[PDB]
DNA sequence: CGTTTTGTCTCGGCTCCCCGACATTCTC
RNA sequence: GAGAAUGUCGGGGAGCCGAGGUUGUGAAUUGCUUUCAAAAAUUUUGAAAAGCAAUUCACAAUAAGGAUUAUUCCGUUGUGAAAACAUUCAAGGCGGGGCAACUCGCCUU
DNA sequence: AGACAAAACG
């Protein structure tokens, strides 16, 4: 009779919901509720997630965290270097005097920026190494270049000198810190590739392109030849860009089995390709037969103008730096007795590892070279263990009681698929599944070649000795042939065949000098564990040697065979090793099967089932299936399902169906939901918000009572992911426990389709209602454009229908320009019965009669469907006209964070490493505090700076976007003179003057554009801006960094009112809000400077009501008589700046037309949003607006 | 004051866990 | 419909590293402007200082900040009034692995 | 590419 129907329409970031109480038989019913919950998401994300580009806040957070981690590790390395050098007494006194060695070990003292080589005496800075600079000057003079060079170039002179001569210890400390700065490229695993690994960057010139008589696509493909005598692997067609062209590749050469090089090719571009640049730089360094430091020094001697950082040597292999540092340290150890002292080395070890005795003892066997290179500077941590994230077994659990007097479950991790147990398990399954057929007649020729246990044992033995089986091999084993039979499985596919044991056996046969019985099952497992667990080069080699020593095997060929074992691919089965060990005895047969190897419980169940007795743990389906298992010996070679049941007592997964008896169950499910459990954050957010909305609807309209929702209909309209998951979750609310409703989804869940929705909307008149609803916007557009092209008259209906001109019809949609249509969709989905979906999905009737009943019951006479009730259209219009869209807000600023860090704790007279919690109140800022770009503060006497504003400058590349207006924004006036002269010389065309060729020409002949006076080359210039930027911080040089508020951080907009009644508006910066919230105060000050009391604060997505011009809303309240007129005056905050707040009418989702600078028209002017009302009154919203509060269901919380 | 225009951090490598969609064989 | 095995194509998360850029300190060279402060004929040449830079080098900071002395970290994710949490999380035993720290397994509550 | 935040423009 009376049925409560909940229709849901789920979008990318929208949730339309409708609740109706329908009685279809009597054509009665009513709409209980409608609404649309919006999850604000910029169109950038909506357009990006379709293709996908780091579309995740979590990803950005992780990127920032990784950058911070690298920075922190560099700082820690510097601090440890400082401590070690201080103990060694290598730091200069003035430099060490400003470093803390008592409390903040190795850190610079607060408000100091010491430099190792610049000594400050009474405000004058002096270079520290004068003699080295003089020697460098002698070098340059001998090179005949100049004698005026920067002092800090001495670092490279020292680096070259340190290789073969004594240098001062302070210079050595400088070199060590510089080495710490730049570490180079290094891969943790390593695995030196093909011995040749040519990977040589070469530049080759094409000699001729011999059309190789290869006509393809109506054109003869040409080959290529190079002066060296090489032929390009691929053919060429466009000869214009290949004829005598000096192209560059990365060629890889491999000595093929025949005994020749298999040279490949890979076209690259220098100064654009990472690999090409790296290889070219490395080859240049190598060909000089000199260290990287010496290479840099000599290049700098040749060309003093050369850029080093970012131009000459960018990323290179860490081996170069390591070799140079090793050479320097080895040479300098001969001269400085401090590097030979054991007492000082022990002191340094104690300083660094005062609490790690094991590491101290390990280091006591090394020297300073190892300490500086391997321990401090070039130490790279290994990857964190991921084995904690491995899936759990679905069968085997363990139960234990914690200190809280409870009993909870520990899970068993799944088995790696490289484990021999898994290999045998899979092999037995595959053997049982196999069956043969004959080509001619396609008959089950099996049961004739695999009938007795002997045949199965023969097949199992044949398979074990392999790593892969195919059509031909399997057919041959039986002596059969391809010309007469087939193996059911794909006729050209291969299957894994116990590869682990194969590989181990092959690499153990290659060792020779061992009897052909060494490899047994236990040895196989031990070797597999050695290979799988020790994933580190040195560790792996030591483990291999130790294994070859414990077992009397020659560790010369063995190590060589097993030193290049390919690591096992990362993959895990469904079950754990315990479950597989339990199941295998059942699955084995023949000589591999023995009764004593079945666990006690399984043997008991076998005894019970053979006895035919009664056990509550044994189901009747069992005795149906295990009828043939009369005797104990029948329990051989059982397929996975049977053995799984026998061991565990459940016929695979039976599910639970479940039933939620009140809203509390849904609340618990929401509470226990785990983040990152679904495909992507978007669908997870939509789903979770849908569940919250459903819970709110349940509580509001049914008090959370059991079985309130008679039916739930769903629609989506990529997004498909939320089609079945949501249905499965929601089936727990509308399930039936009488047994009639069983399955993945309850029969009360009725997914729809677009066909029914659109057809019903057309037939029920909802399209007319929607068009009448949206018409006034198009009338307003007509008025704005002073035309009549946004509304088209039709005489069949005798009225105006909204329309858009063709030029603005790119992606226009009459439905997408308003949020409320989501609710409308839900309504159509809540009134479409299972009869409607069946009728319009299976309209193919095979006979008019059998579906004529549905046509009569549902369609007026097949023309149109009957309305759900008489006043359905009127009710739908009235309900749509009074919907307040609810928007989700994200106002997180500060949130408590917990920090657990490793530390040595003294317990029971012993130091033990454990995780300690950081004390105090450490907040976490949940918004970006500023933009990345940083500008410096300047004062230009030729620029007027109004009070309250500052000039800030930043470096920009000189390009074609520099005309006179922008040339006038350069802080330097000499550069402005030069650029103006050059631009005038080029007919005032920046496209010609400031192109790369133009810039190079200007730099060549700068004299001519500077009145004959020399100037340095110009590549970048500091452009300034007059505004209000704030300092990043207050400590150190952070006071000199000026930045701007980040996007979407103007979250608070205060509105105050004086005693007179006048209103004042302000925008609270993020930092002030952070401080106020940390202090425990309100986000907005309760009084401004003038002392005006705060009326209220606005945030993005908040809702305000703008009273009519005549209305005097001072203490109105009465927020229940919300007719359409009142709802038409509800606006939503969009953005804020200064004293300006922008609004959009709450129902508007997309503009009919956006704003373009060319035509200069838009629905809401240039900002796509207005400070005033859309109506003709055009009144400032903030002058009379009053805030309102709405819940998820769109009810005003007056 | 009311409106528009402008500018916005960028690129490289490799490892190891999970989920899902679609094919194949087989069992219940 | 559920499950096991074998592949292809996508997505999510976490982790170990690399190279620039920007701002700021110091420096080498060359410029523009102003002021001093001379010499010369309102104009021209010279020293100093300040402001603003350009090319190159070393160095500091790189989300404000808060711990810690472990070769550790927390700060841009989610929930939500508890400014409270999620994203580490028990005990044993029997082994593999290493120069040892530490890492990988199996077994019972 | 998008949309905010603010300088820039009358």
PDB file of N, CA and C in Angstrom, chain A residues 761-762 765-779 790-792 794 797 799-803 812-815 817 820 824 877 880:
ATOM      1  N   UNK A 761      10.441  12.526 -17.698  1.00  0.00           N
ATOM      2  CA  UNK A 761      10.494  13.979 -17.596  1.00  0.00           C
ATOM      3  C   UNK A 761       9.734  14.630 -18.740  1.00  0.00           C
ATOM      4  N   UNK A 762       9.909  14.117 -19.960  1.00  0.00           N
ATOM      5  CA  UNK A 762       9.173  14.666 -21.092  1.00  0.00           C
ATOM      6  C   UNK A 762       7.675  14.427 -20.948  1.00  0.00           C
ATOM      7  N   UNK A 765       5.784  16.365 -17.917  1.00  0.00           N
ATOM      8  CA  UNK A 765       5.797  17.811 -17.970  1.00  0.00           C
ATOM      9  C   UNK A 765       6.902  18.471 -17.179  1.00  0.00           C
ATOM     10  N   UNK A 766       7.788  17.696 -16.552  1.00  0.00           N
ATOM     11  CA  UNK A 766       8.846  18.294 -15.748  1.00  0.00           C
ATOM     12  C   UNK A 766       9.785  19.142 -16.594  1.00  0.00           C
ATOM     13  N   UNK A 767       9.922  18.826 -17.883  1.00  0.00           N
ATOM     14  CA  UNK A 767      10.722  19.672 -18.760  1.00  0.00           C
ATOM     15  C   UNK A 767      10.110  21.062 -18.877  1.00  0.00           C
ATOM     16  N   UNK A 768       8.783  21.136 -18.990  1.00  0.00           N
ATOM     17  CA  UNK A 768       8.114  22.431 -19.026  1.00  0.00           C
ATOM     18  C   UNK A 768       8.349  23.199 -17.734  1.00  0.00           C
ATOM     19  N   UNK A 769       8.252  22.513 -16.595  1.00  0.00           N
ATOM     20  CA  UNK A 769       8.484  23.165 -15.311  1.00  0.00           C
ATOM     21  C   UNK A 769       9.906  23.702 -15.242  1.00  0.00           C
ATOM     22  N   UNK A 770      10.881  22.903 -15.678  1.00  0.00           N
ATOM     23  CA  UNK A 770      12.270  23.343 -15.640  1.00  0.00           C
ATOM     24  C   UNK A 770      12.492  24.550 -16.542  1.00  0.00           C
ATOM     25  N   UNK A 771      11.922  24.523 -17.747  1.00  0.00           N
ATOM     26  CA  UNK A 771      12.092  25.640 -18.666  1.00  0.00           C
ATOM     27  C   UNK A 771      11.484  26.913 -18.094  1.00  0.00           C
ATOM     28  N   UNK A 772      10.286  26.813 -17.513  1.00  0.00           N
ATOM     29  CA  UNK A 772       9.694  27.979 -16.869  1.00  0.00           C
ATOM     30  C   UNK A 772      10.533  28.440 -15.686  1.00  0.00           C
ATOM     31  N   UNK A 773      11.162  27.501 -14.979  1.00  0.00           N
ATOM     32  CA  UNK A 773      12.001  27.857 -13.843  1.00  0.00           C
ATOM     33  C   UNK A 773      13.214  28.664 -14.283  1.00  0.00           C
ATOM     34  N   UNK A 774      13.850  28.265 -15.389  1.00  0.00           N
ATOM     35  CA  UNK A 774      15.099  28.904 -15.804  1.00  0.00           C
ATOM     36  C   UNK A 774      14.902  30.060 -16.777  1.00  0.00           C
ATOM     37  N   UNK A 775      13.693  30.262 -17.298  1.00  0.00           N
ATOM     38  CA  UNK A 775      13.469  31.331 -18.271  1.00  0.00           C
ATOM     39  C   UNK A 775      13.922  32.707 -17.796  1.00  0.00           C
ATOM     40  N   UNK A 776      13.623  33.151 -16.570  1.00  0.00           N
ATOM     41  CA  UNK A 776      13.995  34.526 -16.198  1.00  0.00           C
ATOM     42  C   UNK A 776      15.476  34.820 -16.351  1.00  0.00           C
ATOM     43  N   UNK A 777      16.348  33.829 -16.160  1.00  0.00           N
ATOM     44  CA  UNK A 777      17.770  34.059 -16.394  1.00  0.00           C
ATOM     45  C   UNK A 777      18.031  34.412 -17.852  1.00  0.00           C
ATOM     46  N   UNK A 778      17.361  33.723 -18.776  1.00  0.00           N
ATOM     47  CA  UNK A 778      17.551  34.022 -20.191  1.00  0.00           C
ATOM     48  C   UNK A 778      16.907  35.346 -20.574  1.00  0.00           C
ATOM     49  N   UNK A 779      15.797  35.711 -19.933  1.00  0.00           N
ATOM     50  CA  UNK A 779      15.246  37.047 -20.146  1.00  0.00           C
ATOM     51  C   UNK A 779      16.227  38.117 -19.682  1.00  0.00           C
ATOM     52  N   UNK A 790      18.260  35.045 -26.923  1.00  0.00           N
ATOM     53  CA  UNK A 790      18.355  34.100 -25.819  1.00  0.00           C
ATOM     54  C   UNK A 790      17.013  33.471 -25.462  1.00  0.00           C
ATOM     55  N   UNK A 791      15.941  33.826 -26.168  1.00  0.00           N
ATOM     56  CA  UNK A 791      14.625  33.244 -25.940  1.00  0.00           C
ATOM     57  C   UNK A 791      13.911  33.127 -27.275  1.00  0.00           C
ATOM     58  N   UNK A 792      13.439  31.925 -27.595  1.00  0.00           N
ATOM     59  CA  UNK A 792      12.777  31.650 -28.863  1.00  0.00           C
ATOM     60  C   UNK A 792      11.303  31.369 -28.616  1.00  0.00           C
ATOM     61  N   UNK A 794       7.689  29.785 -29.368  1.00  0.00           N
ATOM     62  CA  UNK A 794       7.072  28.640 -30.018  1.00  0.00           C
ATOM     63  C   UNK A 794       5.561  28.771 -29.912  1.00  0.00           C
ATOM     64  N   UNK A 797       3.237  25.555 -28.057  1.00  0.00           N
ATOM     65  CA  UNK A 797       2.984  25.827 -26.650  1.00  0.00           C
ATOM     66  C   UNK A 797       2.638  27.286 -26.387  1.00  0.00           C
ATOM     67  N   UNK A 799       4.516  30.242 -26.159  1.00  0.00           N
ATOM     68  CA  UNK A 799       5.308  30.887 -25.113  1.00  0.00           C
ATOM     69  C   UNK A 799       6.774  30.892 -25.531  1.00  0.00           C
ATOM     70  N   UNK A 800       7.605  31.489 -24.682  1.00  0.00           N
ATOM     71  CA  UNK A 800       9.033  31.626 -24.932  1.00  0.00           C
ATOM     72  C   UNK A 800       9.782  30.489 -24.253  1.00  0.00           C
ATOM     73  N   UNK A 801      10.689  29.854 -24.994  1.00  0.00           N
ATOM     74  CA  UNK A 801      11.566  28.824 -24.475  1.00  0.00           C
ATOM     75  C   UNK A 801      13.000  29.338 -24.436  1.00  0.00           C
ATOM     76  N   UNK A 802      13.744  29.067 -23.364  1.00  0.00           N
ATOM     77  CA  UNK A 802      15.128  29.547 -23.300  1.00  0.00           C
ATOM     78  C   UNK A 802      15.975  28.942 -24.408  1.00  0.00           C
ATOM     79  N   UNK A 803      16.902  29.742 -24.924  1.00  0.00           N
ATOM     80  CA  UNK A 803      17.777  29.309 -26.003  1.00  0.00           C
ATOM     81  C   UNK A 803      19.054  30.131 -25.945  1.00  0.00           C
ATOM     82  N   UNK A 812      26.809  24.330 -24.114  1.00  0.00           N
ATOM     83  CA  UNK A 812      25.674  24.768 -23.317  1.00  0.00           C
ATOM     84  C   UNK A 812      24.748  23.601 -22.995  1.00  0.00           C
ATOM     85  N   UNK A 813      24.188  23.624 -21.787  1.00  0.00           N
ATOM     86  CA  UNK A 813      23.215  22.632 -21.349  1.00  0.00           C
ATOM     87  C   UNK A 813      22.192  23.312 -20.455  1.00  0.00           C
ATOM     88  N   UNK A 814      20.911  23.171 -20.804  1.00  0.00           N
ATOM     89  CA  UNK A 814      19.852  23.798 -20.022  1.00  0.00           C
ATOM     90  C   UNK A 814      19.722  23.192 -18.631  1.00  0.00           C
ATOM     91  N   UNK A 815      20.240  21.985 -18.419  1.00  0.00           N
ATOM     92  CA  UNK A 815      20.086  21.302 -17.142  1.00  0.00           C
ATOM     93  C   UNK A 815      21.243  21.556 -16.187  1.00  0.00           C
ATOM     94  N   UNK A 817      23.048  24.265 -15.615  1.00  0.00           N
ATOM     95  CA  UNK A 817      23.288  25.645 -15.204  1.00  0.00           C
ATOM     96  C   UNK A 817      22.646  25.931 -13.852  1.00  0.00           C
ATOM     97  N   UNK A 820      19.680  22.721  -8.707  1.00  0.00           N
ATOM     98  CA  UNK A 820      18.436  22.090  -8.288  1.00  0.00           C
ATOM     99  C   UNK A 820      18.061  20.909  -9.172  1.00  0.00           C
ATOM    100  N   UNK A 824      15.570  17.338  -8.873  1.00  0.00           N
ATOM    101  CA  UNK A 824      14.579  16.924  -9.858  1.00  0.00           C
ATOM    102  C   UNK A 824      14.845  15.499 -10.316  1.00  0.00           C
ATOM    103  N   UNK A 877       6.716  21.257  -9.035  1.00  0.00           N
ATOM    104  CA  UNK A 877       7.062  22.662  -9.218  1.00  0.00           C
ATOM    105  C   UNK A 877       7.180  23.372  -7.877  1.00  0.00           C
ATOM    106  N   UNK A 880      10.337  22.191  -6.013  1.00  0.00           N
ATOM    107  CA  UNK A 880      11.564  22.689  -6.624  1.00  0.00           C
ATOM    108  C   UNK A 880      11.744  24.176  -6.355  1.00  0.00           C
TER     109      UNK A 880
END
